[PDB]
Symmetry: D2
Subunit: 308 residues, 4 copies
């Protein structure tokens, strides 16, 4: 099966690299405005293939996207020193208004995976422009933070990450919510389980920061993040390719969430061949509900300001 | 086990991402004077881990490289004076490394590998086999992949080598290339996919000019070398004893003495463990020798 | 690393084939008084190796089990007196093993696991966590697989347990089963795939009667336990610390003292490292207790 | 993709187990005269699946073989104490005359993988009965012995098996031929390479026996072999499924080999989605040519005696 990636930058190329090294798909096509950029990345990656799996990674045009089961959208522009954030956002939205129609043209059945930051905002824009049902436009959302949250909880409890059940919901950013209340280990309540075989506010704060500020720390000393999202996207693509029906905290147009209407944010969603297939609402505490409501408002606002 | 990487730029970090994605080692340590960069990198990659293999990737000082069975030297830039500068960096690194991990195998990645591997050797005071340069592994693999694509047979069944200096002095060894023990050219004709001189020229530029194409429209190469480097690390960690066209200090080659270039070599827990000299034609032996002196002179110039 | 297997019958050999196919360990040693059988087995499996992972599978004596981090006890047959006979075999094996690999974790596979794990414990003189029986791992996994199939969600998102005695006394823990942190039954209704009492009955027989169906038309079960056993071995070799419903000596449970049965447990390099008591309903707590005494009495009878 | 296996015995079931543990196919169907046998094996294997890969292993009928890309033939009868070998052979041939037509009925495009011993004989019978072109009926042949031959040479040379190029050709049995003459390491001649960085007749004899008598030793202390062929078949199935075009020493109807006509034996063959796709004749020494000629005669003879 083949997967598309429009936007052959650091995020786009890293995802292709992960897809190859992990052998998630037989064919991977990079599409970019800068034709030579996409070709150079495909060839560099192709030189890695003999050392991993037989994956056909190549650069192509929208036409070469035909038959793709999923298409990663990692196209976008870089902010100009001095312009406003809503000016930047508007410019990316223009990029999407060019890309979405082109992609669905060549691969009408493809599930759209939005990766361009801010992912929740771009996920809403991708949805409005596509003309598809909500479930077929999926943003990576908080999958990376949710995973780091479990890893951290597992490192603290001295248990395996697979046994830890924890979610980071809402906006993929500063207003994300760590669902501490219903977090579980082996089906048992985390906080409870820890208080015996605990978690002080200082421990929770240190974990909160290890999760919430990771992107910030990475951008700070590297300029951008891509390796992490590359594998995360790779995993989301495998889920679509294999029709796994696995539960991931990904961004998707949500009818109503805690009061706000028609906004895209991360919630535990069942992911398969046709996109998201159902939401799994976990138990939230008043505080958490409120934070999720807060985070939702922030995105709804950006949405309105942008015309979506 | 534990592997180290000195130089947290694109190549060094790509290598770590490969090490992590393929699940090659248990621990990966990134070392760079720009501490925040190595940490940013190690954290970007640690975000990927839950979606691949349980690899502990983190930044550290030379000291943290303690007990590493292999260390990747990917520091520097990418032009004679440049070599001297990169050479001084190695004079600074090689000691600091062997200091913390006296028994680690050194995997030179910095370009130009052949010369840089030469430098690393003399600077290490270790035996010739414990300092291995990535050399022509990507090219050999690309050579077999193109033949495989052309012949329509699986790459594992194609046996071909790219020897010598990693660059334009590369020697594609067509003379003794094989497919299932059969000479390449007759296997090709037998399959109905004969390799014309033009087909081979096409394949030659495909192998020899890849790097140039990748730099031109991308700026630098790192994805390919990251995976190749990780594969080498695996051969060292699992004492694989497999055969790779990697660069290493060679006593004599086609005429020249004490020089480093790529040849088929058995790679294990202690590094290069033996050489497998393939059959070369008159032409191929020429090139390999001319290429050998090219490196020899450059090495002499640097005082190595 | 190195894992050992005592009892080269179908289960013991299936386990080795799983260990080899999945590439769990570097070395696998098969031990059985019928030397030629263990060798035949180890050789049949060594024929598979080139087509999977580099695992050194071979036959050996207890002595060859030196340095094994885990040893699988799959000796015996498959009825009170039988227990006594199997019990005497263990009296013969447990010592001989701890003798060559004093620090290995014991993985009881011989049926009935619960009772046999009890025997192994008392006979080992090790702490309660170092003797682990396969218990209900296959049933728990089959329970989640059926719910997953029915709900149309991935198995990794389904959290359900089968506790107690591995057999007809199995307790399917429906009360606290979940899917993504949501109670199973309401998640099911929410998805439009509500679980009627008949659906659950269907699933119950699917889990509880599998073994019976497999024996009836095949004679014995070994493929499933071979892979489950290999998974446990991996958790011990990689000090995974994951959660498995395995059998182990338990100080007290729902009323009864010093007995071995299955409960969610954290498994690492030193064996069971902790217990995770899930929420049980009045009914489920009953069964688990009745089942607990069933095992307790049988254990007493054998003098354990 | 789905793979079929008619004959749910030790070889058939072991192959299914390997396919599952290695994740070679998404669906695996066991068909057997003994319906309950096949169901019990599928369910036992299904209990292993949660610990490896999501493979759907089930028992079914010939009809349930529809869409299979490859079908393993491991059906056969056990010799009756006292009957002749040609009587046993004839009885297996009767089993195949029932199976082949049924399989091609439900899965006309499937590649037939013969596993039933004697594999070369059964491979010829499978070919004659099928009505397909030669390349679509493939017997496991000497893949296991060829692999053991390389492993042994590699253990002796202290090099990796992947670098060693060696073949065991002809009949899968006592008359198989170890191609010592053109055996290579890193493209270089084995014997030559060893004599420097050697191989005495005592060393070759010890290796010959480690290869040629392995099956005998296994049958002797176990009664039958299956684990080895299970993974070997698994690998052959992966090659067909992925259209790998890899070179394997497998049995197939060969027009002419060293003089004998229309006989099935192992030769280095290119294996892909459509079966064998071309033979790779390595250099043979007079002695080897002769042994191969000898081995071919033996099989041609059995073939005639059986009516194939
Ligand atoms: N990863 C991060 O840390 C981060 C931070 C801030 C913003 N973002 C956003 O995420 C996107 C991806 O990040 P990245 O590092 O890979 O970015 P990048 O700047 O390296 O690459 C962006 C890619 O999208 C391409 N592109 C732009 N318009 C296009 C169009 N109309 N059609 C096809 N391709 C087009 C570019 O040519 C380029 O290859 C960025 O555009 C940016 O807008 C990412
Ligand atoms: N593996 C060995 O060491 C070995 C040795 C000698 C002979 N063989 C031959 O190889 C075959 C496979 O060996 P195995 O151990 O798995 O054998 P097995 O005896 O355990 O199973 C043979 C299977 O083929 C089935 N079968 C017979 N006729 C059938 C028909 N018409 N349709 C569908 N199924 C049918 C049986 O019912 C059984 O499930 C044997 O039949 C035998 O003839 C194998």
């Amino acid at each position: 099966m083949k997967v598309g990636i429009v936007g052959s930058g650091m995020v786009g190329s890293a995802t292709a690299y992960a897809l190859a090294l992990l052998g998630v798909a037989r064919e991977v096509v990079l599409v970019d405005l800068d034709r030579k950029l996409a070709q150079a990345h495909a060839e560099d990656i192709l030189h890695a293939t003999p050392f991993a799996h037989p994956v056909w990674v190549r650069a192509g045009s929208y036409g070469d996207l035909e038959g793709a089961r999923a298409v990663v959208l990692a196209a976008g522009v870089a902010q100009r020193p001095g312009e406003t954030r809503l000016q930047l956002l508007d410019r990316n939205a223009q990029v999407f208004a060019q890309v979405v129609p082109r992609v669905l043209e060549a691969a009408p059945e493809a599930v759209l995976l939005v990766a361009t930051n801010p992912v929740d905002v771009m996920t809403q824009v991708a949805y409005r422009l596509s003309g598809l049902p909500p479930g077929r436009v999926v943003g990576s959302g908080t999958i990376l933070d949710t995973a780091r949250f479990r890893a951290l909880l597992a490192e603290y409890l001295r248990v395996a990450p697979q046994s830890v059940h924890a979610y980071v919901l809402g906006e993929h950013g500063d207003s994300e919510v760590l669902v501490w209340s219903s977090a579980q280990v082996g089906g048992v309540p985390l906080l409870e389980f820890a208080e015996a075989r605990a978690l002080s506010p200082e421990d929770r704060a240190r974990i909160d920061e290890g999760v919430r500020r990771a992107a910030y720390r990475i951008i700070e000393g590297k300029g951008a993040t891509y390796y992490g999202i590359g594998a995360g996207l790779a995993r989301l693509v495998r889920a679509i390719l294999t029709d796994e029906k696995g539960v991931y905290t990904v961004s998707a147009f949500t009818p109503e969430v805690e009061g706000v209407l028609e906004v895209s944010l991360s919630l535990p969603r069942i992911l398969g061949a046709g996109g998201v297939e159902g939401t799994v609402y976990p138990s939230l505490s008043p505080e958490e509900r409120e934070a999720l409501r807060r985070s939702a408002e922030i995105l709804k606002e950006a949405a309105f300001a942008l015309g979506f």
